[PDB]
Amino acid sequence: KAVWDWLILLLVIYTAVFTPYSAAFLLKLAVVDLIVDIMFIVDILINFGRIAVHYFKGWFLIDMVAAIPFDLLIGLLKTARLLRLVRVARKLDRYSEYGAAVLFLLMCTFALIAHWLACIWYAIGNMEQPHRIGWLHNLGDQIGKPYGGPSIKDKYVTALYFTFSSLTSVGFGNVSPNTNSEKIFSICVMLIGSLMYASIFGNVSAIIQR
Amino acid sequence: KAVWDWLILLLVIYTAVFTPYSAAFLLKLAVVDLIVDIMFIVDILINFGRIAVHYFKGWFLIDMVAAIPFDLLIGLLKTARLLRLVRVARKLDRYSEYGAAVLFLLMCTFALIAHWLACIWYAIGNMEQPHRIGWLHNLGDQIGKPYGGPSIKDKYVTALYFTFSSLTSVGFGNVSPNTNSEKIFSICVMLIGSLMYASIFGNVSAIIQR
Amino acid sequence: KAVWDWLILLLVIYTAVFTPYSAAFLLKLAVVDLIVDIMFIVDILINFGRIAVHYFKGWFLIDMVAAIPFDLLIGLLKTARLLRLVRVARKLDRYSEYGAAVLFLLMCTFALIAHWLACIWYAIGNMEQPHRIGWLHNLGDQIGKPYGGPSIKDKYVTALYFTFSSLTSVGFGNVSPNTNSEKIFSICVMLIGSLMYASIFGNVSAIIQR
Amino acid sequence: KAVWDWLILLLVIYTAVFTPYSAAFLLKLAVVDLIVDIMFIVDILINFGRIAVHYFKGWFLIDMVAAIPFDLLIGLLKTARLLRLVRVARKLDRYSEYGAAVLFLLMCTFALIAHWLACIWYAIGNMEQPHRIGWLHNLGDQIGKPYGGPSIKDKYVTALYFTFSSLTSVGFGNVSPNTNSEKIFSICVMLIGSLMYASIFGNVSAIIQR
């Protein structure tokens, strides 16, 4: 139990990294998914004898709905496993004792927001690709693989790099929104990044000043 | 009356959004504008026998100027409705108790400043267009609609996206000033955005701690 | 003498604005500059028997060397008039009483640094006359006036706009250094702008609350 | 004694500047670094009979490994002289006594981080070059030196300018990543730049008001 919470935090990080990635990119390893589901089942079993009634009124419903496999496009239902983040949200008391832990958690949240926005950006680009104006076509032209098209690794790296540059307000000019949906998404990302800097990069300075 | 105050704030936000838009874009529904005008007349009616003399020498002239209809250019004279913003600026104390409502108001005023600057940017672009130089011609080339050029949706979205990038200091490089009026406007927006952005988001970071 | 300090401040701002501009751009009105020099001579005269030795011991040398006419590329010596800028520094005792005055003065210093860096940037870009390389040739190509070349208005506005984009860290994309001297100057501008952003726009965030 | 270790700080800055530059750009004079290592041998002799065992227990081995000559990948082993900054890290009491000294040291470490990132960026670009995609090819085609190729001066200046623009979040658009390795390096540099820029310049803004 002493190291169970940090293992669950790592598990939540893994699923937060690889669930939106699998939804956006790979939908078009399984054994690791089965292993992590088994570990979360073990966790919920441990969570349970006069206190089980308290758990039932508490977070039992959310953990149960996030732990039940949905196998019977059914692949979009796997998003429900993103509900495991409530475990980290509710156990913040233990995850706020060390300064290095707080720094690592802040970078984890920053990288996760960038990753989720990258998945959304690729979703938009791939939705609009079939119907020379989108960012995917320009990327393929500028990396020497005209639309075939860029490999999945190239698309993910470009999406993450664009999202990081927009969040950090560098705006490299390599990747620029050109369609109305891309422009509106970029406006939303600019607003999100403004709020995220005002919070996170003030907190980081304040707790480095410690 | 508190519900009435919040309703008046909502209508003031609506007019601050839709009268500069109509002045900049739509010149060359209205029933909602008429309804809002009737609601504002209702507000100036409920505003009022002992206190009537007190208010008559107060803001009443300002409210009257922003309430009279100029339906005898009429379109540019209809911009007098922007004076209703004092109806919100004069009782901001009623909008400073929730704490998070102040954050919402700061986000709203940042978005409103961006929208007004977008309308000014489009006004400059349209006043220069008839005379490959200019943001409208470049936008028409990029978007795939060479100059009748881009639709009003594309023009407004591009203007708002450019203004947001300039205020947030991203500088995407998709749209960039190229004419002397555009360059001077961009210098003014750079100064104004630095000053505002710094003030607004310093306040936002301050209220995040609470 | 009650309002003489503010008038002298306006004259100092004028000379700071217009001496580097004449040194860089116009070298290739006189009456206003002559009137300003006469007014500065009047200023040193009026503020001059027990206290004469006090002035002789103090700022007499700097005030004198910044007031003697240089008439006899000899106009390059007129840049010594920038030593009059120390008068606002030594009268910051009174110029700092009002918060609005402090904010206006901070914006003035920011704009003056941008203007001086614009003059230096144009000077650097104009040293490369003997040599599609350099910001002046790119500027001429962009605005449809290939080298003739752009007018002095276009050159000054473009230099000021590039300097403002660099200092604020927007980097619009039209103007970008392409020569080792330009790149090194841009690195220096980035260092100076980081130093001033840490100073000017932290002090502004402190001042606004005050 | 203070003059001695301030000279040692200057020597440490010299070697931190000139070790990665020689390791990366000149992999294809020795009197200065011979003098520097002789001076550091003199320093290790000064550092040492009662206290000799005290130093032997402590920093003796760290200072010895960074001072032993490596003459006998063979030329790459000289990067071990980059453990010498522990000399200035271990004695921050003197170096941080003055506020102006801390300001100068913060500027120096920011410039050093930019220099190291420039060396890494050039190493990546050079390892990718012999395989219009790389940044070196674009630099050569934009500077007027088609790939021969740009001189070492041009390559170093361009790398340093790109690194400074990325750290300061300008993103000029002249140099932008176009390969997966370059994009990953840029993402990591954006995270690093956010952290170091925020920490360093929060410290700077704390210092200036003092």
Ligand SMILES: Cc1cccc(CCN2CCC(C(=O)c3ccc(NS(C)(=O)=O)cc3)CC2)n1
């Ligand atoms: C990082 C980040 C994420 C989201 C929003 C903003 C907006 C506020 N955010 C403050 C730091 C600024 C900054 O880092 C900077 C400003 C001016 C500079 N001028 S200069 C000549 O390049 O040194 C350099 C850096 C950039 C804007 N930010």
